[PDB]
Symmetry: C2
Subunit: 101 residues, 2 copies
């Protein structure tokens, strides 16, 4: 379980690294998923040895630019049918109309 | 030798990773060494295996 009252899970990542747990399933929101990805990258346990499955459906919103070249295999799911043209049009319309946060 | 066109040593670091060259000596400047470290972190070449 990720630590409560905080998002800095460095002790948890260090415990998993020390325990040689290479395949991990993450049950957290995409924001906390990004946070834990950054913590793990800072922990140096994000390489081809490690495979992370994310149960969150917002894995497409993740910024994986620092992470693609590492050789990791981050697997997840995406129910948002972005492949469809109408879905892409609706998504772009929502993004343009948002202009918020 | 690091690439001369630009400070993008990603092909060199990929070749080093493929060849399992963990122990590396870098003859650069600290400005260039920082960029090399940033690009090595992007390939997970900064772990307990590499020195």
């Amino acid at each position: 379980q990720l630590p409560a009252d905080t998002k800095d899970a460095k002790p948890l990542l260090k415990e998993m690294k020390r325990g040689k747990e290479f395949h991990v399933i993450f049950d957290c929101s995409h924001e906390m998923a990004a946070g834990i990805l950054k913590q793990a990258l800072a922990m140096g346990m994000m390489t081809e040895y490690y495979h992370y499955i994310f149960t969150t459906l917002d894995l497409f919103a993740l910024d994986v630019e620092p992470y693609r070249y590492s050789g990791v295999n981050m697997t997840g799911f995406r129910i948002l049918n972005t492949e469809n043209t109408q879905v892409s049009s609706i998504i772009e319309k929502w993004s343009m109309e948002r202009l918020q946060a």
